[PDB]
Write an enzyme that holds these catalytic residues in place. Structure first.
Site, PDB file in Angstrom:
ATOM      1  N   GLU A 135       0.805  -1.221   0.000  1.00  0.00           N
ATOM      2  CA  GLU A 135       0.000   0.000   0.000  1.00  0.00           C
ATOM      3  C   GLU A 135       0.839   1.274   0.000  1.00  0.00           C
ATOM      4  O   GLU A 135       0.727   2.098   0.907  1.00  0.00           O
ATOM      5  CB  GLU A 135      -0.965   0.009   1.191  1.00  0.00           C
ATOM      6  CG  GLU A 135      -1.882  -1.203   1.261  1.00  0.00           C
ATOM      7  CD  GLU A 135      -2.776  -1.187   2.487  1.00  0.00           C
ATOM      8  OE1 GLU A 135      -2.762  -0.174   3.220  1.00  0.00           O
ATOM      9  OE2 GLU A 135      -3.490  -2.186   2.717  1.00  0.00           O
ATOM     10  N   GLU A 240      -5.860 -11.010  -0.645  1.00  0.00           N
ATOM     11  CA  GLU A 240      -6.789 -10.879   0.475  1.00  0.00           C
ATOM     12  C   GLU A 240      -8.244 -10.886   0.020  1.00  0.00           C
ATOM     13  O   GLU A 240      -9.037 -10.049   0.451  1.00  0.00           O
ATOM     14  CB  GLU A 240      -6.497  -9.592   1.255  1.00  0.00           C
ATOM     15  CG  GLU A 240      -5.019  -9.351   1.537  1.00  0.00           C
ATOM     16  CD  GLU A 240      -4.766  -8.083   2.332  1.00  0.00           C
ATOM     17  OE1 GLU A 240      -5.732  -7.525   2.894  1.00  0.00           O
ATOM     18  OE2 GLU A 240      -3.597  -7.646   2.394  1.00  0.00           O
TER      19      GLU A 240
END
Length: 337
Positions: A135, A240
């Site tokens: 991220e 995820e």
């Protein structure tokens, strides 16, 4: 051919996320056996993050992580190392000196590299894939103003991968991020990845967190992300994967948590149809994808139960609150039958 992993071999590995409590509790044994039957890859939910593994950047807590890696080798799993460098869940003491005022670029670089050398070094050769950087791109198509970026620049990504490849040269290095179906964010990522790889930075793959909703994003944008990443030289990883089936956009409200009594049949089918449509695209580009990992096994262990609203009842996974296979699960099996 017992588990979903056996149905999806020759395509990509089917993985799941393992919680710390599952490893440190003897009453969570059936969950461990359930994972071993269904999945051929594992990812630690929290035990390999900076803060839970090394609180206040002092003494290490290898115990939880050791039981994770041992569980993987015990069943020949595709073990994924979750997060070497992340902007979140990292002790504040890291980004400050011994005073402690704001740490310098060179000193912070030493902290990052020492962390990698110790973490990736302990499980050298025992871990197939590492989540090196996670991220780093802001959703508005720019650099995330994390302490990592504001101090070390954007080249902290280049150094993290370089350090990791030196420590464990056999591990498949991965850059993970969410909202990869957003063109403005996706373009910034692919551009960043291409620039680093051209400079010799060992980026072997890019992970799509795939925190999708019951409605969107579309499978067309998902497909485009797969193509963009393949043309970028990296390998595709679904890291995820979960499907939020609750009304979104916080305070709890009886109307935004309408499935407390259970999930209706039309919702189970809409969810089954959802998962099916996604895996249809995955199978179409199976040569691009190396691994598909769901963020959890059963519905009772999802983070979406309490986020972004605490106390809600969500159904994002393939197994329900009683560890029973949902219609979505069988829907994915029929694709390979």
């Amino acid at each position: 051919r017992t588990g979903i992993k056996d149905f999806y071999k020759d395509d990509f590995r089917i993985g799941t996320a393992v919680a710390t409590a599952t490893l440190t509790m003897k009453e969570k044994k059936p969950l461990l056996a359930l994972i071993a039957r269904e999945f051929n890859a594992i990812t630690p939910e929290n035990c390999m993050k900076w803060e839970p593994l090394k609180p206040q950047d002092k003494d290490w807590h290898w115990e939880a992580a050791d039981k994770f890696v041992e569980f993987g080798e015990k069943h020949k799993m595709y073990i994924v190392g979750h997060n070497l460098v992340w902007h979140s869940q990292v002790p504040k003491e890291v980004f400050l000196n011994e005073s402690g005022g704001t740490i310098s670029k060179e000193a912070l670089t030493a902290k990052m590299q020492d962390h990698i050398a110790t973490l990736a070094g302990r499980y050298k050769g025992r871990i197939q894939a590492w989540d090196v950087v996670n991220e780093a791109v802001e959703d508005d198509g720019s650099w995330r103003k994390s302490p990592w970026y504001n101090i070390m620049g954007e080249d902290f990504i280049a150094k993290a991968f370089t350090m990791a490849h030196e420590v464990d040269p056999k591990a498949h290095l991965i850059y993970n991020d969410y909202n990869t179906e957003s063109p403005i964010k996706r373009n910034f990522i692919v551009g960043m990845i291409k620039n680093f790889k051209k400079q010799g930075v060992p980026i072997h793959g890019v992970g799509m967190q795939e925190h999708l909703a019951i409605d969107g994003p579309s499978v067309d944008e998902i497909e485009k992300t797969l193509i963009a990443l393949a043309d970028a030289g990296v390998r595709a990883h679904i890291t995820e994967l979960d499907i939020d089936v609750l009304p979104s956009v916080f305070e709890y409200k009886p109307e935004r948590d309408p499935y407390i009594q259970g999930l209706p049949k039309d919702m189970e089918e809409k969810l089954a149809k959802r998962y099916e449509d996604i895996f249809k695209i995955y199978l179409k580009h199976r040569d691009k994808i190396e691994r598909v990992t769901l963020w959890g096994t059963a519905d009772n262990e999802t983070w979406l139960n309490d986020f972004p609203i605490k106390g809600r009842t969500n159904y994002p996974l393939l197994f329900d609150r009683n560890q029973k296979p949902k219609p979505a699960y069988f829907r994915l099996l029929d694709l390979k039958k």
